[PDB]
Short mmCIF file of all heavy atoms in Angstrom, two decimals:
data_model
loop_
_atom_site.label_atom_id
_atom_site.label_comp_id
_atom_site.label_asym_id
_atom_site.label_seq_id
_atom_site.Cartn_x
_atom_site.Cartn_y
_atom_site.Cartn_z
N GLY A 1 8.21 -3.86 -5.21
CA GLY A 1 8.15 -3.03 -3.95
C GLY A 1 7.61 -1.65 -4.21
O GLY A 1 8.28 -0.80 -4.81
N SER A 2 6.34 -1.47 -3.92
CA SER A 2 5.79 -0.14 -3.81
C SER A 2 4.92 0.08 -2.60
O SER A 2 4.32 1.17 -2.41
CB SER A 2 5.02 0.22 -5.08
OG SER A 2 3.86 -0.65 -5.17
N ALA A 3 4.86 -0.95 -1.71
CA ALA A 3 4.16 -0.75 -0.45
C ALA A 3 5.13 0.14 0.35
O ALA A 3 6.38 -0.13 0.43
CB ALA A 3 3.91 -2.04 0.29
N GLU A 4 4.63 1.19 0.92
CA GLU A 4 5.43 2.13 1.64
C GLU A 4 5.31 1.93 3.18
O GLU A 4 6.11 2.47 3.96
CB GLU A 4 5.03 3.53 1.24
CG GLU A 4 5.48 3.92 -0.18
CD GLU A 4 4.79 5.17 -0.73
OE1 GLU A 4 4.14 5.84 0.07
OE2 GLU A 4 4.96 5.49 -1.97
N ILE A 5 4.30 1.23 3.61
CA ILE A 5 3.98 0.92 5.02
C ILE A 5 3.80 -0.59 5.13
O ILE A 5 3.14 -1.17 4.26
CB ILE A 5 2.63 1.59 5.39
CG1 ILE A 5 2.70 3.07 5.05
CG2 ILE A 5 2.23 1.35 6.84
CD1 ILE A 5 3.69 3.89 5.87
N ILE A 6 4.20 -1.15 6.26
CA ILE A 6 3.84 -2.51 6.65
C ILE A 6 2.97 -2.45 7.89
O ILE A 6 3.40 -1.98 8.88
CB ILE A 6 5.10 -3.26 6.92
CG1 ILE A 6 6.07 -3.24 5.74
CG2 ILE A 6 4.79 -4.72 7.29
CD1 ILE A 6 7.50 -3.35 6.25
N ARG A 7 1.72 -2.85 7.75
CA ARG A 7 0.80 -2.86 8.87
C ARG A 7 1.12 -4.08 9.74
O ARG A 7 1.48 -5.15 9.19
CB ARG A 7 -0.66 -2.96 8.38
CG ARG A 7 -1.12 -1.67 7.74
CD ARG A 7 -2.08 -1.82 6.55
NE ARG A 7 -2.17 -0.51 5.76
CZ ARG A 7 -1.35 -0.16 4.72
NH1 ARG A 7 -0.39 -0.94 4.19
NH2 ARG A 7 -1.57 1.04 4.11
N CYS A 8 0.91 -3.94 11.02
CA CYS A 8 1.27 -4.99 11.96
C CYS A 8 0.38 -4.93 13.20
O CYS A 8 -0.09 -3.86 13.59
CB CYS A 8 2.77 -4.87 12.40
SG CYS A 8 3.25 -3.26 13.00
N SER A 9 0.21 -6.11 13.82
CA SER A 9 -0.48 -6.21 15.09
C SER A 9 0.45 -6.45 16.24
O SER A 9 0.02 -6.49 17.42
CB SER A 9 -1.52 -7.37 15.04
OG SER A 9 -0.86 -8.57 14.76
N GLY A 10 1.72 -6.73 15.91
CA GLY A 10 2.80 -6.83 16.88
C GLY A 10 4.12 -6.90 16.15
O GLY A 10 4.23 -7.11 15.00
N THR A 11 5.15 -6.84 16.97
CA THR A 11 6.50 -6.79 16.41
C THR A 11 6.92 -8.05 15.67
O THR A 11 7.71 -8.00 14.77
CB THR A 11 7.49 -6.46 17.58
OG1 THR A 11 7.26 -5.05 17.93
CG2 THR A 11 8.92 -6.61 17.08
N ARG A 12 6.33 -9.18 16.07
CA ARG A 12 6.67 -10.47 15.38
C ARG A 12 6.35 -10.38 13.89
O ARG A 12 6.99 -11.06 13.10
CB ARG A 12 5.87 -11.61 16.02
CG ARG A 12 4.42 -11.57 15.77
CD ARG A 12 3.78 -12.61 16.72
NE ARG A 12 2.41 -12.94 16.35
CZ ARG A 12 1.97 -14.01 15.67
NH1 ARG A 12 2.86 -14.83 15.05
NH2 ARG A 12 0.68 -14.29 15.56
N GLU A 13 5.35 -9.57 13.53
CA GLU A 13 4.97 -9.42 12.11
C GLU A 13 5.91 -8.48 11.29
O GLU A 13 5.82 -8.41 10.08
CB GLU A 13 3.53 -8.88 12.05
CG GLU A 13 2.54 -9.93 12.49
CD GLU A 13 1.10 -9.51 12.17
OE1 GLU A 13 0.91 -8.33 11.91
OE2 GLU A 13 0.25 -10.41 12.09
N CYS A 14 6.84 -7.88 11.97
CA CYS A 14 7.68 -6.90 11.23
C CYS A 14 9.02 -7.52 10.81
O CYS A 14 9.70 -7.00 9.92
CB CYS A 14 7.97 -5.70 12.10
SG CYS A 14 6.49 -4.77 12.49
N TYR A 15 9.48 -8.58 11.44
CA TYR A 15 10.80 -9.14 11.19
C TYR A 15 10.95 -9.51 9.76
O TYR A 15 11.93 -9.12 9.10
CB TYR A 15 11.16 -10.30 12.14
CG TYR A 15 11.49 -9.83 13.48
CD1 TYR A 15 10.68 -10.14 14.54
CD2 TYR A 15 12.63 -9.04 13.73
CE1 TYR A 15 10.94 -9.63 15.87
CE2 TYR A 15 12.95 -8.61 15.01
CZ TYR A 15 12.09 -8.87 16.03
OH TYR A 15 12.40 -8.48 17.31
N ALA A 16 9.99 -10.29 9.17
CA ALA A 16 10.17 -10.79 7.81
C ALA A 16 10.23 -9.70 6.77
O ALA A 16 11.17 -9.65 5.96
CB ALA A 16 9.08 -11.78 7.50
N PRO A 17 9.28 -8.75 6.77
CA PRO A 17 9.33 -7.75 5.72
C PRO A 17 10.46 -6.81 5.91
O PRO A 17 11.03 -6.32 4.91
CB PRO A 17 7.98 -7.04 5.82
CG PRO A 17 7.50 -7.29 7.22
CD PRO A 17 7.96 -8.69 7.48
N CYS A 18 10.84 -6.46 7.17
CA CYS A 18 11.97 -5.60 7.38
C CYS A 18 13.25 -6.28 7.00
O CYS A 18 14.10 -5.60 6.52
CB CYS A 18 12.08 -5.06 8.84
SG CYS A 18 10.69 -3.84 9.20
N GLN A 19 13.35 -7.55 7.12
CA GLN A 19 14.56 -8.28 6.68
C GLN A 19 14.66 -8.34 5.23
O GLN A 19 15.73 -8.28 4.68
CB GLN A 19 14.63 -9.70 7.25
CG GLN A 19 15.90 -10.38 7.04
CD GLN A 19 15.90 -11.85 7.38
OE1 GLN A 19 14.86 -12.55 7.14
NE2 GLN A 19 16.98 -12.37 7.98
N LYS A 20 13.55 -8.52 4.56
CA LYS A 20 13.54 -8.51 3.09
C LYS A 20 14.14 -7.22 2.60
O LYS A 20 14.94 -7.23 1.69
CB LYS A 20 12.14 -8.73 2.59
CG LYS A 20 12.07 -8.81 1.10
CD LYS A 20 10.68 -9.11 0.59
CE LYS A 20 10.71 -9.12 -0.94
NZ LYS A 20 10.83 -7.73 -1.46
N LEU A 21 13.74 -6.11 3.22
CA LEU A 21 14.14 -4.80 2.69
C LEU A 21 15.56 -4.50 3.09
O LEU A 21 16.31 -3.91 2.30
CB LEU A 21 13.27 -3.73 3.23
CG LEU A 21 11.84 -3.63 2.67
CD1 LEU A 21 11.04 -2.60 3.48
CD2 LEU A 21 11.79 -3.29 1.19
N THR A 22 15.94 -4.77 4.36
CA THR A 22 17.20 -4.31 4.87
C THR A 22 18.30 -5.37 4.95
O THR A 22 19.51 -4.99 5.12
CB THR A 22 17.06 -3.67 6.32
OG1 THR A 22 16.87 -4.70 7.25
CG2 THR A 22 15.89 -2.67 6.39
N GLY A 23 17.90 -6.63 5.01
CA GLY A 23 18.86 -7.69 5.23
C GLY A 23 19.01 -8.09 6.67
O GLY A 23 19.75 -9.02 6.95
N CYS A 24 18.42 -7.32 7.58
CA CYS A 24 18.66 -7.54 9.06
C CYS A 24 17.34 -7.75 9.78
O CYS A 24 16.35 -7.19 9.34
CB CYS A 24 19.41 -6.36 9.73
SG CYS A 24 21.18 -6.38 9.27
N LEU A 25 17.43 -8.44 10.91
CA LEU A 25 16.23 -8.75 11.76
C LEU A 25 16.26 -7.73 12.87
O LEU A 25 17.08 -7.87 13.79
CB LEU A 25 16.34 -10.25 12.37
CG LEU A 25 16.28 -11.30 11.30
CD1 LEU A 25 16.97 -12.59 11.75
CD2 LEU A 25 14.85 -11.52 10.82
N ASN A 26 15.57 -6.65 12.74
CA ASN A 26 15.68 -5.55 13.64
C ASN A 26 14.52 -4.63 13.32
O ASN A 26 14.47 -3.94 12.27
CB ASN A 26 17.05 -4.87 13.45
CG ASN A 26 17.34 -3.76 14.46
OD1 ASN A 26 16.66 -3.53 15.41
ND2 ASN A 26 18.47 -3.01 14.19
N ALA A 27 13.48 -4.68 14.17
CA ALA A 27 12.13 -4.08 13.81
C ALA A 27 11.29 -3.93 15.04
O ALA A 27 11.61 -4.54 16.13
CB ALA A 27 11.41 -4.99 12.83
N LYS A 28 10.25 -3.09 14.91
CA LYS A 28 9.33 -2.78 15.97
C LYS A 28 7.98 -2.45 15.43
O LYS A 28 7.87 -1.57 14.56
CB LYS A 28 9.86 -1.64 16.90
CG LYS A 28 8.89 -1.29 18.01
CD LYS A 28 9.13 0.07 18.65
CE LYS A 28 9.56 -0.09 20.03
NZ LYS A 28 9.65 1.17 20.80
N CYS A 29 7.00 -3.05 15.92
CA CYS A 29 5.60 -2.59 15.59
C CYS A 29 5.24 -1.45 16.54
O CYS A 29 5.22 -1.59 17.74
CB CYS A 29 4.58 -3.78 15.75
SG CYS A 29 2.98 -3.27 15.09
N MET A 30 4.97 -0.23 15.95
CA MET A 30 4.59 0.93 16.76
C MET A 30 3.40 1.55 16.06
O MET A 30 3.43 1.79 14.85
CB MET A 30 5.73 1.95 16.78
CG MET A 30 5.75 2.92 17.94
SD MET A 30 7.42 3.59 18.18
CE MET A 30 7.00 4.95 19.31
N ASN A 31 2.34 1.81 16.76
CA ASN A 31 1.11 2.46 16.16
C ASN A 31 0.59 1.68 14.96
O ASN A 31 0.08 2.27 13.99
CB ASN A 31 1.37 3.92 15.89
CG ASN A 31 1.99 4.64 17.05
OD1 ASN A 31 1.47 4.54 18.14
ND2 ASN A 31 3.07 5.39 16.83
N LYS A 32 0.68 0.34 15.04
CA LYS A 32 0.24 -0.63 14.05
C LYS A 32 0.87 -0.52 12.70
O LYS A 32 0.35 -1.01 11.67
CB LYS A 32 -1.30 -0.55 13.88
CG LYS A 32 -2.12 -0.74 15.15
CD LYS A 32 -3.53 -1.29 14.87
CE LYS A 32 -4.37 -1.34 16.15
NZ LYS A 32 -3.87 -2.29 17.23
N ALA A 33 2.10 -0.03 12.69
CA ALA A 33 2.94 -0.02 11.48
C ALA A 33 4.38 -0.40 11.90
O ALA A 33 4.81 -0.02 13.02
CB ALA A 33 2.99 1.35 10.88
N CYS A 34 5.10 -1.05 10.99
CA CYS A 34 6.42 -1.50 11.29
C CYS A 34 7.46 -0.42 11.17
O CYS A 34 7.41 0.30 10.13
CB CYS A 34 6.88 -2.68 10.39
SG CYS A 34 5.84 -4.11 10.63
N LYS A 35 8.34 -0.30 12.11
CA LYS A 35 9.57 0.39 12.00
C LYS A 35 10.72 -0.62 11.65
O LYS A 35 10.90 -1.60 12.44
CB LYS A 35 9.90 1.18 13.18
CG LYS A 35 8.94 2.30 13.43
CD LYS A 35 9.64 3.17 14.50
CE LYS A 35 8.68 4.10 15.17
NZ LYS A 35 8.53 5.31 14.38
N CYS A 36 11.44 -0.38 10.57
CA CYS A 36 12.55 -1.24 10.17
C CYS A 36 13.78 -0.47 10.59
O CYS A 36 14.00 0.66 10.12
CB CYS A 36 12.54 -1.52 8.65
SG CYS A 36 11.11 -2.28 7.97
N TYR A 37 14.60 -1.04 11.46
CA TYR A 37 15.74 -0.29 12.00
C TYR A 37 17.08 -0.51 11.29
O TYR A 37 18.06 0.22 11.49
CB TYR A 37 15.94 -0.67 13.51
CG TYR A 37 14.80 -0.14 14.34
CD1 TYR A 37 14.10 -0.97 15.14
CD2 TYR A 37 14.53 1.22 14.43
CE1 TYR A 37 13.09 -0.49 16.00
CE2 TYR A 37 13.49 1.72 15.19
CZ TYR A 37 12.83 0.85 16.04
OH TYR A 37 11.79 1.36 16.89
N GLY A 38 17.16 -1.57 10.50
CA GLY A 38 18.27 -1.81 9.69
C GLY A 38 19.41 -2.52 10.37
O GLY A 38 19.13 -3.22 11.34
N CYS A 39 20.61 -2.31 9.85
CA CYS A 39 21.79 -3.08 10.23
C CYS A 39 22.89 -2.20 10.86
O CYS A 39 23.17 -1.17 10.34
CB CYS A 39 22.44 -3.70 8.99
SG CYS A 39 21.33 -4.78 8.03
N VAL A 40 23.58 -2.72 11.92
CA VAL A 40 24.91 -2.11 12.22
C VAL A 40 25.98 -2.61 11.25
O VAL A 40 25.91 -3.80 10.84
CB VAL A 40 25.40 -2.49 13.69
CG1 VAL A 40 24.77 -1.52 14.68
CG2 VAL A 40 25.11 -3.92 14.01
#
């Protein structure tokens, strides 16, 4: 892991990499990059 950004064309593309990092399915594609929101 040294990719610091995940590029995306929509939110569906963010779930997998955000889950890998955080353990949770909670993400949003904004400005063609993923936001990983993490876990409650």
Side-chain angles (χ1 to χ4, degrees):
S2 64
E4 289 167 9
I5 306 295
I6 304 150
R7 288 144 197 90
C8 53
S9 60
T11 292
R12 68 190 194 101
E13 290 192 339
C14 296
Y15 286 112
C18 291
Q19 191 191 36
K20 182 175 178 289
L21 288 171
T22 74
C24 285
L25 294 157
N26 185 10
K28 179 199 246 189
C29 189
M30 205 160 168
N31 312 307
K32 305 206 185 296
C34 296
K35 293 196 198 273
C36 302
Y37 292 124
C39 301
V40 279

